[PDB]
Amino acid sequence: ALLRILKETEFKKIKVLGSGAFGTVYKGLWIPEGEKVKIPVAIKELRPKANKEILDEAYVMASVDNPHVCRLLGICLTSTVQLIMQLMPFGCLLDYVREHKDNIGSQYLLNWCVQIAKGMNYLEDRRLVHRDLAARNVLVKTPQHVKITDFGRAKLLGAEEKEYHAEGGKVPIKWMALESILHRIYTHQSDVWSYGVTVWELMTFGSKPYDGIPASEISSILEKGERLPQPPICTIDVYMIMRKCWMIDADSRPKFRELIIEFSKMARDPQRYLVIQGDE
Numbered sequence: 001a002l003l004r005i006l007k008e009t010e011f012k013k014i015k016v017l018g019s020g021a022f023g024t025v026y027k028g029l030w031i032p033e034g035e036k037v038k039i040p041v042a043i044k045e046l047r048p049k050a051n052k053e054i055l056d057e058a059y060v061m062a063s064v065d066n067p068h069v070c071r072l073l074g075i076c077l078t079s080t081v082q083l084i085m086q087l088m089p090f091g092c093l094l095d096y097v098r099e100h101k102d103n104i105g106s107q108y109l110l111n112w113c114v115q116i117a118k119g120m121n122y123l124e125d126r127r128l129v130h131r132d133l134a135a136r137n138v139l140v141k142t143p144q145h146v147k148i149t150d151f152g153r154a155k156l157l158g159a160e161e162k163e164y165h166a167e168g169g170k171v172p173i174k175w176m177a178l179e180s181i182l183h184r185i186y187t188h189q190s191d192v193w194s195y196g197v198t199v200w201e202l203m204t205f206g207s208k209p210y211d212g213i214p215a216s217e218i219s220s221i222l223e224k225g226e227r228l229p230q231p232p233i234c235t236i237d238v239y240m241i242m243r244k245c246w247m248i249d250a251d252s253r254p255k256f257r258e259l260i261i262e263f264s265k266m267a268r269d270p271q272r273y274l275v276i277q278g279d280e
C-alpha cells in the first residue's frame with residue numbers, strides 16, 4: 001500500500017455521506033489519470049500545516065494495510081485537504097445493526113467482534129492508539145466484513161512512548177477508559193476498554209450505553225464499580241469478556257491478541273454463546 005497523490009480532475013464527489021467537526025465525507029468516483037478505471041471511493045474533505053507535513057502523515061496512514069482497517073488510497077492537496085479512502089457500501093456498523101436487528105444472528109455478531117479485534121491488534125502492532133473506537137466508527141464493507149475507520153483522534157506512539165497524554169480535545173466519555181477520563185491517558189489497553197463498549201453496542205443491537213446518564217456523571221459511576229449491564233442475548237461467558245475489558249487496572253484487561261483467540265473460539269459454536277430466537 002502506497003500513497004497516491006491526486007489531481008482535482010482525477011475524482012468527483014457524488015453525494016454527502018456524513019459530516020462533523022473533522023469535515024465532510026462524500027461518496028465519489030476516482031478515475032486515475034489515463035487508467036480507464038472508475039473506482040468508487042469515500043472522499044473526506046477536512047476543515048494550516050505545510051503540505052510536506054500533511055503528506056508525511058498521509059504516507060504513514062496509507063501504509064496501514066489490513067483487511068479490517070479502512071485504507072487511505074490517496075490524497076489531494078488544494079485549498080482544502082481531501083482524503084480518498086475505500087468506500088464502505090453499507091455505512092457504519094452502528095446504523096446497520098439498528099436497521100437489521102431482526103435478521104442478525106449469533107454468527108455475524110461474533111465474527112464482527114473477531115474482525116474488529118483483528119483490526120485493533122494490527123493497529124497496536126503499528127503502535128497506533130485509536131482513541132475513538134465505537135460502533136459508529138466501524139464501517140461495513142459487506143454484512144460479512146467490517147473495517148475500523150478513523151476521523152482524526154488516532155495517535156502514533158513514539159519509540160519509547162508507552163502512552164499518549166492528550167490535551168483538551170473533546171472526548172467520547174461513554175466509550176472511554178477511566179484513566180483516559182481522569183488523566184487524559186490513552187494506551188492500547190484503553191482502546192480495549194472502548195472495544196468492550198463497542199461489543200456491548202453490537203450485542204444490544206445499537207443501544208445507547210449508560211442511557212440517560214449525563215456524561216459528567218460517568219467517572220463517578222465507574223469509580224463506584226458500576227458497568228454496562230449484561231445484554232439479553234449474551235451468555236455469561238461473553239459478558240465476562242466485556243467485564244474484563246472494563247477492569248480499572250489497564251493491565252488486568254485482556255489484549256487484542258487474546259480477544260481474537262477467545263472470540264474466534266466462540267465464533268466456532270456461536271449459538272452456544274449468544275442466544276437469539278430463530279437463530280437458526
Ligand SMILES: *CCC(=O)N1C[C@H](COc2nc(Nc3cnn(C)c3)nc3[nH]ccc23)[C@@H](C(F)(F)F)C1
Pocket residue numbers: 017018019020024025042070085086087088089090091092093094095135136137139149
Ligand atoms: C454510524 C456512523 C455513520 O453512519 N457515519 C457516516 C460517516 C462515514 O463516512 C464513511 N462512509 C462510508 N460509507 C457509507 C456511509 N453511508 N453509507 C450508506 C455508506 N465509507 C467510508 N469510508 C471512509 C469513511 C466513510 C461518518 C460521519 F458522519 F461522521 F462522517 C460516520
